Amino acid sequence: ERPSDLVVNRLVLFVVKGTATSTHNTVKPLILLEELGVPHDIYVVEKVSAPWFSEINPHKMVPAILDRSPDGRDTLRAWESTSTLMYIADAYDKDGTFGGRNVQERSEINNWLTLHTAALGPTAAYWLYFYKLHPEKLPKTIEKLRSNITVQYDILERRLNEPGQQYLALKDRPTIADIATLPFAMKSTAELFGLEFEKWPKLQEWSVRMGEREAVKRAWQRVAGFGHGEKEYGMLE
Amino acid sequence: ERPSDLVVNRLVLFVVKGTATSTHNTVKPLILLEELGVPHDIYVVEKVSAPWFSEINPHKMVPAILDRSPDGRDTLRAWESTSTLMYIADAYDKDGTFGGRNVQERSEINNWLTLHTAALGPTAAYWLYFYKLHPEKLPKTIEKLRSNITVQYDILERRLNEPGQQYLALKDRPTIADIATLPFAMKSTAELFGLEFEKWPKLQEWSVRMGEREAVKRAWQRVAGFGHGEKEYGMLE
Ligand code: NA
Numbered sequence: 271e272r273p274s275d276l277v278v279n280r281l282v283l284f285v286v287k288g289t290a291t292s293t294h295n296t297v298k299p300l301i302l303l304e305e306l307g308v309p310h311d312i313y314v315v316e317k318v319s320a321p322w323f324s325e326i327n328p329h330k331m332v333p334a335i336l337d338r339s340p341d342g343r344d345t346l347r348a349w350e351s352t353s354t355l356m357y358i359a360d361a362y363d364k365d366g367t368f369g370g371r372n373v374q375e376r377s378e379i380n381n382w383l384t385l386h387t388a389a390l391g392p393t394a395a396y397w398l399y400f401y402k403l404h405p406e407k408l409p410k411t412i413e414k415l416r417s418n419i420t421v422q423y424d425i426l427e428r429r430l431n432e433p434g435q436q437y438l439a440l441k442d443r444p445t446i447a448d449i450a451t452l453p454f455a456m457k458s459t460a461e462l463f464g465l466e467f468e469k470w471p472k473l474q475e476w477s478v479r480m481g482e483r484e485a486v487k488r489a490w491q492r493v494a495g496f497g498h499g500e501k502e503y504g505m506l507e
Numbered sequence: 508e509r510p511s512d513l514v515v516n517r518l519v520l521f522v523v524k525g526t527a528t529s530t531h532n533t534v535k536p537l538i539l540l541e542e543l544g545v546p547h548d549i550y551v552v553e554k555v556s557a558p559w560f561s562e563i564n565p566h567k568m569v570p571a572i573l574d575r576s577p578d579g580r581d582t583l584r585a586w587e588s589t590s591t592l593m594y595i596a597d598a599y600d601k602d603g604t605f606g607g608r609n610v611q612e613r614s615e616i617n618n619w620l621t622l623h624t625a626a627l628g629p630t631a632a633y634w635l636y637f638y639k640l641h642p643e644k645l646p647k648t649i650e651k652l653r654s655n656i657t658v659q660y661d662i663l664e665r666r667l668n669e670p671g672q673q674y675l676a677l678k679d680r681p682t683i684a685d686i687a688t689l690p691f692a693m694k695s696t697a698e699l700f701g702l703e704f705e706k707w708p709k710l711q712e713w714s715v716r717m718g719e720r721e722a723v724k725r726a727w728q729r730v731a732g733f734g735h736g737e738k739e740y741g742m743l744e
Contacts, residue, residue, distance in 0.1 A: 339611045347618065352624065373583070411645055411648040
């Protein structure tokens with residue numbers, strides 16, 4: 271059984287209480303929702319281990335989405351942060367401004383999106399798990415993961431050093447690839463991993479260029495705030 | 508400089524010499540090519556570290572694809588196995604048989620495809636890295652990765668126990684989510700991880716149903732043989 275305040279009249283984004291370590295994945299769909307101006311509600315999950323929530327996301331994590339299918343026939347769900355980006359793009363990015371307009375664009379967008387999904391994303395998640403959550407401290411494993419993060423920053427830097435390459439996928443404009451990558455490829459996160467972000471100057475420039483976008487600023491301010499307003503948990507107003 | 512035998516007249520799939528542990532990602536786009544009957548060449552890479560290959564895939568791994576743009580005027584690329592699947596479906600699966608025919612299908616395909624890309628895939632990759640490749644054995648790290656594989660198997664098993672859920676994403680037919688998951692969710696790979704696959708009966712059943720598809724059989728038989736024929740490295744005839 272779902273909670274009584276969980277209703278789907280529009281896209282619902284599931285998040286947890288905003289903290290330094292709880293927003294790096296949930297901010298991704300929120301950025302895209304802000305960029306596209308998609309109507310959405312925010313649901314602050316108290317316990318991701320709750321049975322009702324594993325019905326939405328069997329991986330028991332945020333972000334998750336419930337939305338009405340375009341024809342209204344189904345309650346669609348999206349879970350995994352990359353999958354929330356693909357879903358919002360598919361349902362709402364009519365012009366492929368973030369999703370890609372043609373096969374050529376999508377080919378690079380899916381390359382840089384998947385690189386994050388498969389490499390930087392999971393490495394950073396394992397780095398954080400072993401550094402902070404694992405009952406035993408495994409410093410050899412932690413150091414290898416931190417080393418793998420520098421290799422991923424090395425790839426992103428090489429790409430942003432190519433002529434006219436202002437963004438990861440496309441030269442001209444940011445895509446879901448850029449949105450997926452940003453939270454793990456900015457100064458505060460690099461500082462968390464124990465790295466000096468200035469060592470990747472084009473990547474740092476890119477992070478600032480992205481950070482200056484109004485949608486991204488609005489996303490960061492809101493995700494930090496979720497659960498710390500008049501409502502602690504459940505559907506926000 | 509690019510090798511003299513590398514030309515893009517059609518889709519070229521980049522692979523390495525076939526072994527039990529070198530083919531679980533390259534097999535994914537090869538299954539989809541076989542399923543759709545996409546004309547393609549195979550290129551056996553001697554050294555993924557070779558500077559010419561890093562210009563194709565900066566992550567210096569297989570699989571990677573070079574192919575002609577829709578209009579045939581330009582060359583495009585896909586790299587990361589999941590990205591190779593998304594590209595082939597975009598360019599060649601116009602009926603959305605494997606890519607998904609609508610927002611509802613694609614929502615579930617992208618959920619189960621991204622779960623593999625973000626969770627089982629990277630976990631299996633780190634497991635193999637620490638188990639064979641890393642210069643010192645780290646048994647606690649390997650144990651935790653193994654345990655995380657069982658948690659991914661538990662999620663897949665829960666899904667395939669849902670009434671009528673014959674495949675991971677859709678009830679009725681396999682998609683790129685199934686193709687992506689299979690190599691890391693079959694008896695042989697389970698045995699390699701030191702797991703008893705019988706503990707996940709619906710997952711084992713699904714693996715056998717996928718394995719009985721002619722395209723999946725053709726892919727497995729071909730990928731094992733790359734680099735063992737009359738031409739060891741370069742463009743196969
Ligand atoms: Na089943």
